[PDB]
Each structure stands twice: as structure tokens, then as C-alpha cells.
């Protein structure tokens, strides 16, 4: 899930009050890879938000269609959020 | 989205009556 961008080494003496103690440190800088999240967490949310705009192109009198579309988009967003909370 | 585009061009709000010749 990560990619090691860089690794570093440092040697130093920690000046603790009683006396100085040696120390080495090996650091890694990880950078997270996002193709998972872009393809799976952002794409469906963007698509559902786009689908929610379809109601504006439907007539006002078509109450059942617009209501079903809007509330089912809300339900789909709820499902995505809850299950993504569970998985992540 | 295809259905949305189809519905955008629908004129009459009533389907075929089943007893007419168009
Ligand atoms: C951002 C996209 C939102 C979802 C799609 C909404 C458009 C669906 C209806 C199709 C309209 C396009 C045809 C317009 C015809 C015209 O020029 O009058």
C-alpha cells in the first residue's frame, strides 16, 4: 500500500542530564498509493453525486421519479460511507 | 443517464392507450 520515498540515517549523542548516550536512527518516508482509493472511494461518490443532479432535468410534476432518485442517491451515499468505514 | 436524456424529450405524459391506431 505504500512506496518508500526515501530512507535516511543519523548518528547523534542524546545529552541526557546525567550524561550523554549514543544513538543511531534509521528513518523511512512512506508515501501512500491512492489508485485503490481513487478507483473505489472517490469514483462511486462522484458518480452518485452526478446522478443526483438528474432530478433537475425531470419535470416538477414527476414527483415519484424525482423523489425516488434523490432519496435512493442519499441511501447509496449512506451505504458507501458506512461500508467504507467498516472496511477502512 | 440514457433514460434521463430520453425523458427530457418526452412530450406527452400518457402512455399508449392500447385502443388506438396512433
Ligand atoms: C452533469 C450531468 C448531469 C446529468 C445529465 C443531465 C442531462 C440529462 C438530459 C439531457 C439533456 C441534453 C439534451 C439537451 C437538448 C437541448 O439542447 O435542448
Q: Does B15 touch chain A (CB under 8 A)?
A: no
Q: What three-state secondary structure class fits B2?
A: helix
CB pairs under 8 A, 24+ apart, for A4-10?
Answer: A4/A28, A4/A29, A4/A30, A5/A29, A5/A30, A5/A31
C-alpha cell at A23: 544513538
DSSP string for chain A: -EEEEEEEEEEEEEE-SS-EEEEEEEEEEEEE--HHHIIIIIHHHHHHHHHHGGGGGS-TT-HHHHHHHHHHHHHHHHHHHHHHHHH-
C-alpha cell at A21: 548516550
Distance from CA of B17 to the nearest CA of A (A): 20
Q: Does B6 touch chain A (CB under 8 A)?
A: no
DSSP count for chain B of H helices, then E strands: 1, 0
The experimental method, as deposited, was cryo-EM
Q: Which residues of A58-83 are buried (b: 16+ CB within 10 A; e: fewer)?
A: eeeeeeebbeebeeebeebeeeeeee
Calculate how far, in angstroms, residue A80's C-alpha sits from the geometric centre of ligand 1.
26
* Distance in angstroms (rounded) separating the CA atoms of residues A11 and A14: 10
Query: Using the 8-state DSSP alphabet, how is residue B19 labeled?
Result: S
Q: Are strands A20-32 and A2-15 parallel, antiparallel or unpaired?
A: antiparallel
Amino acid at each position: 500500500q505504500f512506496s518508500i520515498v526515501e530512507h535516511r540515517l543519523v548518528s547523534r549523542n542524546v545529552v541526557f542530564a546525567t550524561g550523554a548516550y549514543p544513538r543511531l536512527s534509521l528513518s523511512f518516508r512512506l508515501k501512500r498509493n491512492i489508485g485503490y482509493f481513487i478507483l473505489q472511494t472517490y469514483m462511486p461518490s462522484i458518480l452518485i453525486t452526478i446522478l443526483s443532479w438528474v432530478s433537475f432535468w425531470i419535470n416538477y410534476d414527476a414527483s415519484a421519479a424525482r423523489v425516488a432518485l434523490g432519496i435512493t442517491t442519499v441511501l447509496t451515499m449512506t451505504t458507501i460511507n458506512t461500508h467504507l468505514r467498516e472496511t477502512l | 443517464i440514457e433514460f434521463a436524456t430520453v425523458n427530457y424529450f418526452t412530450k406527452r405524459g400518457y402512455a399508449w392507450d392500447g385502443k388506438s391506431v396512433v
